[PDB]
C-alpha cells in the first residue's frame, strides 16, 4: 500500500514536473507585513493576499544576487521541484512569479515557527518528542527519494511547526532531481555526510546521514560534530567518532550509529531493504507510520497561536525594501521560472 501510494504519487509529480505551473500571481496582489526569515538565499516575508484575506509566506530572491552566487540552476530546481510535490510534511507552494528584479515563491504560512527556535529555547527534546518529528522526516524522505529527489539541507532551521504541531519542510534551494550521483558541495557544515566533504560523488544517502544528525541534535540539544569554524567540523565528521549523551537510550544510539555510518554499504536508508531498515528499528517500535502520515497522532508540543498573521513565533529581522527595476534583469537565465 506504501508502494501503491508512491506509484500514484510519482504519476502526480511527473505531470507537474514536465509541465510546471508558471506566473500564477503578481506582487501587487499582496500586502507585505514582516520578514520572518533569511537564507540560505533571499528572505521570506509574511504577506496577506488582498483578494482572499489569506496569509502566506513569500520568499523573494534577487535575480542578480542569485546569478553572482552561481545559484541559477539550483533556484530553477527549487521552484520546479516545489511546485510539483505534494506531501503532508512539505510546505506548499501556492504561487510563483517574477518581475524585472526578483523571483517570488509564495508558500502557505506556517505560524508555529522553526523547529530550531523551540529546540534551542527548551534545550533538547525527549526521545518521544524527537521520534514523533523524526518519523515525519523519514516518510518525507521516503516520498522525495521515490521521486529521485535529493533534499540536501535537513536541519531544524528548515523545519516549520504547524498549528497542529506537525512539520513542514521548507527551503528547497539545494533539492535536485538526479537518478545517479551528483557532486555539488552544498548543505550545512554540521549536517554534511563525509562523502560530500570528501568530494566523492554522492546520492540520496547524504539525506539519511543528515537525518542522523538531526535526531541526535533534537535528542541531545547539540549536534554530534560541532566546532567554532566549519573546517574543524569537517575534521570531526571524517573521523566519525561520535559520542552520545549518557541519557540516550541504547536503541537511540544504535539507530544513530547506523545513520551516522561512514560506510555506505552499512548506512541505513541506502541498503537493499531501503527505508524499512529505519522504520522497523526498535527506536521506532511505538511509531504508527500510517497514523503519523494521517496526522492522527497527538503532537507532543502545540505552538501558541495569538491570531492569523501573528509572527511572534519567529525572530525579528531587519526589513529591506523590495526594489523593482524598470529594466528586466537576467531574463534568459530565469525564463522557465
Amino acid at each position: 500500500s506504501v508502494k501503491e501510494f508512491l506509484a500514484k504519487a510519482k504519476e502526480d509529480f511527473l505531470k507537474k514536473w514536465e509541465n510546471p505551473a508558471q506566473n500564477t500571481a503578481h506582487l501587487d496582489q499582496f500586502e507585505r507585513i514582516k520578514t520572518i526569515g533569511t537564507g540560505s538565499f533571499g528572505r521570506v516575508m509574511l504577506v496577506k493576499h488582498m483578494e482572499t484575506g489569506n496569509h502566506y509566506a513569500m520568499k523573494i530572491l534577487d535575480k542578480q544576487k542569485v546569478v553572482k552566487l552561481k545559484q541559477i540552476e539550483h533556484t530553477l530546481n527549487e521552484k520546479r521541484i516545489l511546485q510539483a510535490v505534494n506531501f503532508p510534511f512539505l510546505v506548499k507552494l501556492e504561487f510563483s512569479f517574477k518581475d524585472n528584479s526578483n523571483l517570488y515563491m509564495v508558500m502557505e504560512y506556517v505560524p508555529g515557527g522553526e523547529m530550531f527556535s523551540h529546540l534551542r529555547r527548551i534545550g533538547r527534546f525527549s526521545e518521544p518528542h524527537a521520534r514523533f518529528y523524526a518519523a515525519q522526516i523519514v516518510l518525507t524522505f521516503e516520498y522525495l527519494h521515490s521521486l529521485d529527489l535529493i533534499y540536501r539541507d535537513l536541519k531544524p532551521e528548515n523545519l516549520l511547526i504547524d498549528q497542529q504541531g506537525y512539520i513542514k519542510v521548507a527551503d528547497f534551494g539545494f533539492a535536485k532531481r538526479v537518478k545517479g550521483r551528483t557532486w555539488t558541495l552544498c548543505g550545512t557544515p554540521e549536517y554534511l555526510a563525509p562523502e560530500i566533504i570528501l568530494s566523492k560523488g554522492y546520492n540520496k544517502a547524504v539525506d539519511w546521514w543528515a537525518l542522523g544528525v538531526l535526531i541526535y541534535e533534537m535528542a541531545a540539544g547539540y549536534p554530534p560534530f560541532f566546532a567554532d569554524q566549519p573546517i574543524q567540523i569537517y575534521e570531526k565528521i571524517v573521523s566519525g567518532k561520535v559520542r552520545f549523551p549518557s541519557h540516550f537510550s541504547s536503541d537511540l544510539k544504535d539507530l544513530l550509529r547506523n545513520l551516522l555510518q561512514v560506510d555506505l554499504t552499512k548506512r541505513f536508508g541506502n541498503l537493499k531493504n531501503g527505508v524499512n531498515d529505519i522504520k522497523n528499528h526498535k527506536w521506532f517500535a511505538t511509531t504508527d507510520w500510517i497514523a503519523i502520515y494521517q496526522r492522527k497522532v497527538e503532537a507532543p508540543f502545540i505552538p501558541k497561536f495569538k491570531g492569523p498573521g501573528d509572527t511572534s513565533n519567529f525572530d525579528d529581522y531587519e526589513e529591506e525594501e523590495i526594489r523593482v527595476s524598470i529594466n528586466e534583469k537576467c531574463g534568459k537565465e530565469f525564463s522557465e521560472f
Partner: peptide, 20 residues
C-alpha cells in the same frame, strides 16, 4: 560539559548553508 561547550560556541544561532 558538552552542552556548555556548545552554548559557549559561535554556532548556536541559525546556520547558513555553504557553497563553493
Amino acid at each position: 560539559t558538552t552542552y556548555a561547550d556548545f552554548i559557549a560556541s559561535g554556532r548556536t544561532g541559525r546556520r547558513n548553508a555553504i557553497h563553493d
